[PDB]
C-alpha cells in the first residue's frame, strides 16, 4: 500500500495564459444587402444565436488591463482594412495649379466675414490639346497665400498628392464580434465594482464577446457602454501626473449637432473616365453649424463626478476646470464624424467652473474641414465630396479623458484639462473585462495501483 | 412546463473541487478538441495550428503504450525525492493547478522513464513469445 506507482490521466482541466490570433464574426442581418461600406465586408462568418455562459466557483484570478494584448492587434486590423478599402479610386494629381480667388458677399453675417472664397482656374480636358476655365468655392482652412494681384495655392501641394474618395461608400459603423479558435478560452470577470486591476473571485467563460462599434473621436467618447452603480475613475498610477485618467459615467447625456446650410453639386471631366466633384451654388442665407446640450443635466453630472473624485486627494481641497492648454488644431478641439462629414467644435464653454470644500441650453459653434490626415500619419490625405441637403444627428456622451496639471507643494487645489490624442485609449475603454487562456490536457499523479502484465 | 428548466453539464467548470472529484468528469473535455483578402487569411493559420496541436498529443500518448484509453497504469515506481505527502490529503484537499505548480520542476525525467520502461517490456515479451 505504501509503495506506489505512477499513473497517467487525460483531459485534465488545467490552463495557462498565452497569445494567439483572433477572428471575426458578424450578424447575418448586415449581410442582407448593404454591399457598400468600409467595414462589414462579407468575409466574416455568420454568427449564431442563443449564446451560452458557463459559471465557475471557488476561483480567483488576477487581471491587468494596462499590460494587455489584443488591442494593438485590432488597431492594426482597422488600419489595414481602411487602407484596403481606400485603394481603388481616382487620383487627384493635376489640380496643383495657381488659382484666382475673391470674397463672397451674399448677405453673409458678420461672424463669417472671409470664411468662404470663390476661386477659378484652368484645367485640361480629355483631349490633350485644349484647356478650359472652371470655378468652385472653398473654405479658409484649405487654401494658403504666396508672394496688388491675388493668388492662392493648395495647402498639401508641396507635401503629397492624395486620392479622392469614391462616391458610393458608407462610413456607418455596425456591431462586430470577436471569437477565438478551438483550443482556447475567453474569460470574463463579472464583478460590478472591480477597478480594472487586481484579483477577481467571480469569473465566467464565453466564446464570443458582445457587440463592439468602432468609433473615432477625441476629447470625448460617444455611444459607449453605461456603468451600473456609479461614475467610476480608472488610471495606471493616479499619483503620477504624466498618465491620463479615464472617467466612465453612470447615465447618458444627449447632444444635438446640426448644419442648417444648403448645398448643391456639380461634375467635371478631367480625362478618360476621370470625373471630379465640386461645390455648386448656395441658395439663401448662411449660418454656422452648431451643437446643443442641456444645462441641468451637465450640472448634476459634474457635481456627482466631483463628489466621487474627492475620495483620493482629501476633502479639504479645491477643484478648478480649465479648457485645453493649446497646440495643434487636432487635439485642442473635439473632432467627430456624422453623416460623412467632419466637424471641429470648440469646447471652451464646458470645462469652466470651480468647486470648493463643504430649460436653458448650452450652445457651442463648430467649423468644417475638407482635407483630413487621421491616425497622425504623413503623406496620406483625402478628399470629402460635398453632400446635398441639411444634416442632423443625435448621440450620447458616456465618458471623459482627463489629465492632471502639475502643481507646487500642497496648495490645497488641483486643476485638470482634457487630453487624449492616441486612439489606443478609445479601444482600451471597452476591452478591460476579457482575458484569453490556453488548455493543457495532460496530467500525471501517483497512485497505489500497479499495472498488470 | 411551468417550473421545469434545463440543467446541462458544460465546459471546464469543475476546476474548483478536490483533486479526486474532478477526475470523475473528464470525458466531456476530451470531446471538444477538433471542433469544426487579409480579412480571412488568418483562419488557415488557426486551423493548421489546431490540427498540429491535436496530432502532437496523439503521438505522445501513442508512444507511451496507453493509447485508446483515458486511465492507464504503468510500472515506473514513484520516489519520495520528487515530492512528499500521503494519499489521503492529496486526494481529499487539493486542486489540479496547485499540483501543477507543485510538480513543475521534475517533469522531463518523469516523462523519460516511461519509454525505456515500455521498451524493456516489449523486448522481454518478444523473446517470451519467440522462444516457442
Amino acid at each position: 500500500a505504501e509503495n506506489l506507482w505512477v499513473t497517467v490521466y487525460y483531459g485534465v482541466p488545467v490552463w495557462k495564459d498565452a497569445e494567439t490570433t483572433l477572428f471575426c464574426a458578424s450578424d447575418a442581418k448586415a449581410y442582407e444587402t448593404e454591399k457598400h461600406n468600409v467595414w462589414a465586408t462579407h468575409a466574416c462568418v455568420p454568427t449564431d444565436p442563443n449564446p451560452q455562459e458557463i459559471h465557475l466557483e471557488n476561483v480567483t484570478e488576477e487581471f491587468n488591463m494596462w499590460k494587455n494584448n489584443m488591442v494593438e492587434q485590432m488597431h492594426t486590423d482597422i488600419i489595414s482594412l481602411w487602407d484596403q478599402s481606400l485603394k481603388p479610386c481616382v487620383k487627384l494629381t493635376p489640380l496643383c495649379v495657381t488659382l484666382q480667388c475673391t470674397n463672397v458677399t451674399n448677405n453673409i453675417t458678420d461672424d463669417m466675414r472671409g470664411e468662404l472664397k470663390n476661386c477659378s482656374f484652368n484645367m485640361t480636358t480629355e483631349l490633350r490639346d485644349k484647356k478650359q476655365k472652371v470655378y468652385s468655392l472653398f473654405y479658409r482652412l484649405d487654401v494658403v497665400q504666396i508672394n496688388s494681384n491675388k493668388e492662392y495655392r493648395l495647402i498639401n501641394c508641396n507635401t503629397s498628392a492624395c486620392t479622392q474618395a469614391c462616391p458610393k461608400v458608407s462610413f456607418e459603423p455596425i456591431p462586430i464580434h470577436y471569437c477565438a479558435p478551438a483550443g482556447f478560452a475567453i474569460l470574463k470577470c463579472k464583478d460590478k465594482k472591480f477597478n480594472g486591476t487586481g484579483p477577481c473571485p467571480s469569473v465566467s467563460t464565453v466564446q464570443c464577446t458582445h457587440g463592439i462599434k468602432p468609433v473615432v473621436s477625441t476629447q470625448l467618447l460617444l455611444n459607449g457602454s453605461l456603468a451600473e452603480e456609479e461614475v467610476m475613475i480608472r488610471s495606471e498610477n493616479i499619483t503620477n501626473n504624466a498618465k491620463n485618467i479615464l472617467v466612465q459615467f453612470n447615465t447618458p447625456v444627449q447632444i444635438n449637432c446640426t448644419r442648417p446650410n444648403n448645398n448643391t453639386r456639380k461634375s467635371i471631366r478631367i480625362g478618360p473616365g476621370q470625373a471630379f466633384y465640386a461645390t455648386g451654388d448656395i441658395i439663401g442665407d448662411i449660418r454656422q453649424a452648431h451643437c446643443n446640450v442641456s444645462k441641468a443635466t451637465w450640472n448634476e453630472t459634474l457635481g456627482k463626478v466631483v463628489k466621487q473624485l474627492r475620495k483620493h486627494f482629501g476633502n479639504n481641497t479645491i477643484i478648478r476646470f480649465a479648457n485645453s492648454s493649446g497646440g495643434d488644431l487636432e487635439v485642442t478641439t473635439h473632432s467627430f464624424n456624422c453623416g460623412g462629414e467632419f466637424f471641429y467644435c470648440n469646447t471652451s464653454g464646458l470645462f469652466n467652473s470651480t468647486w470648493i470644500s463643504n430649460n436653458d441650453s448650452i450652445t457651442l459653434p463648430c467649423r468644417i474641414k475638407q482635407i483630413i490626415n487621421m491616425w497622425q500619419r504623413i503623406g496620406q490625405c483625402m478628399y470629402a465630396p460635398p453632400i446635398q441637403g441639411v444634416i442632423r444627428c443625435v448621440s450620447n456622451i458616456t465618458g471623459l479623458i482627463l489629465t492632471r496639471d502639475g502643481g507646487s507643494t500642497n496648495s490645497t487645489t488641483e486643476t485638470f484639462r482634457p487630453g487624449g490624442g492616441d486612439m489606443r485609449d478609445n479601444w482600451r475603454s471597452e476591452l478591460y473585462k476579457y482575458k484569453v487562456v490556453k488548455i493543457e490536457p495532460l496530467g500525471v499523479a501517483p497512485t497505489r495501483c500497479k499495472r498488470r502484465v | 412546463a411551468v417550473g421545469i428548466g434545463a440543467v446541462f453539464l458544460g465546459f471546464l467548470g469543475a476546476a474548483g473541487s478536490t483533486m479526486g472529484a474532478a477526475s470523475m468528469t473528464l470525458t466531456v473535455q476530451a470531446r471538444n478538441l477538433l471542433s469544426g483578402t487579409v480579412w480571412g487569411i488568418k483562419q488557415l493559420q488557426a486551423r493548421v495550428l489546431a490540427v498540429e496541436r491535436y496530432l502532437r498529443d496523439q503521438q505522445l500518448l501513442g508512444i507511451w503504450g496507453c493509447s485508446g484509453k483515458l486511465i492507464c497504469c504503468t510500472n515506473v515506481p514513484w520516489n519520495s525525492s520528487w515530492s512528499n505527502r500521503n494519499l489521503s490529503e492529496i486526494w481529499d484537499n487539493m486542486t489540479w493547478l496547485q499540483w501543477d505548480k507543485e510538480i513543475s520542476n521534475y517533469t522531463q525525467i518523469i516523462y523519460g522513464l516511461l519509454e525505456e520502461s515500455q521498451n524493456q517490456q516489449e523486448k522481454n515479451e518478444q523473446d517470451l513469445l519467440a522462444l516457442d
Partner: antibody, heavy 122, light 107 residues
C-alpha cells in the same frame, strides 16, 4: 445533493409585517436554471402553495390566495431569496418549508427542506 | 381549474397487506401527474415522477398505472414505514393542485 435552509422570527403579532429568507446552493451542477418554491404546512391538512421563482430573474410569480400581501425578492449577491407578508394574522399558523428543483436529465430531484414554525398570535 | 379525488380517503390498512390507492382527476389531463409521500417529522418527497412513469430509484414495492383522469398505485405489501400520506399532483396549466392526502393508518 443540494442543502437548503430557512429561518425566521418567533410568533409575530397580527397587524405586523412578517419576513423570511431562504438560502440554497448550486452544488454539483455547474450551470442551470434552478427553480425555487415556497410552501407551508398548516395543521390538520396537507400542503399549501405560496408561489415560486426562478434563479435567473427577480420577477416573481405568486399564488391566488393572497396576492396583495405577498412580496418575493431574489438576493443575487448570496444566491438567496426573501419572502415577506404584510397584514399578518393568526390564520398563518403553519410550518413553512423552502423547496427547490432541478431538471437533471428527466429525473427531477427535490430537496423540500426541514420546516420552521411560523405561527402568528398576539 | 382541476380537482381530484383520492380513494380510500381514510383507510387504516393492516400491516403486511397489498394496498391500492386510486386518484381520479376532474377533466382530462392527458398524462401529466406525479405522486408524493410525506410524514410528520420531515418534509415531503417524491414517490412517482410522471405518474405513468416510475420514479427513478423508487422501490419496486410501489407500482403505478393510469391515464387521463384515472390512476392507480399498487403496493405489494404495507411496510411499517409506508404508513404515510400520499398526494397526487397535476403537472399542467396553472394553478397547481396537489393531492388531497390519503393517510395510511395502522389497524
Amino acid at each position: 445533493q443540494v442543502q437548503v435552509q430557512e429561518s425566521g422570527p418567533g410568533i409575530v403579532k397580527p397587524s405586523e409585517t412578517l419576513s423570511l429568507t431562504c438560502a440554497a446552493s448550486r452544488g454539483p451542477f455547474s450551470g442551470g436554471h434552478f427553480y425555487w418554491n415556497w410552501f407551508r404546512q398548516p395543521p390538520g391538512k396537507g400542503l399549501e402553495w405560496i408561489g415560486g421563482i426562478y434563479s435567473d430573474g427577480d420577477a416573481a410569480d405568486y399564488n391566488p390566495s393572497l396576492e396583495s400581501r405577498v412580496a418575493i425578492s431574489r438576493d443575487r449577491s448570496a444566491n438567496r431569496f426573501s419572502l415577506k407578508l404584510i397584514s399578518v394574522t393568526t390564520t398563518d399558523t403553519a410550518v413553512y418549508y423552502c423547496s427547490s428543483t432541478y431538471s437533471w436529465n428527466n429525473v427531477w430531484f427535490d430537496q423540500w427542506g426541514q420546516g420552521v414554525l411560523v405561527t402568528v398570535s398576539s | 381549474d382541476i380537482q381530484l379525488t383520492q380513494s380510500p380517503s381514510s383507510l387504516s390498512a393492516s400491516v403486511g397487506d397489498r394496498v391500492t390507492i386510486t386518484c381520479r382527476a376532474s377533466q382530462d389531463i392527458n398524462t401529466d401527474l406525479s405522486w408524493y409521500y410525506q410524514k410528520s417529522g420531515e418534509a415531503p418527497k417524491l414517490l412517482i415522477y410522471r405518474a405513468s412513469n416510475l420514479q427513478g430509484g423508487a422501490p419496486s414495492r410501489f407500482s403505478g398505472t393510469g391515464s387521463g383522469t384515472e390512476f392507480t398505485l399498487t403496493i405489494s405489501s404495507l411496510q411499517p414505514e409506508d404508513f404515510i400520506t400520499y398526494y397526487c399532483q397535476q403537472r399542467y396549466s396553472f394553478p397547481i393542485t396537489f393531492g388531497a392526502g390519503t393517510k395510511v393508518d395502522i389497524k
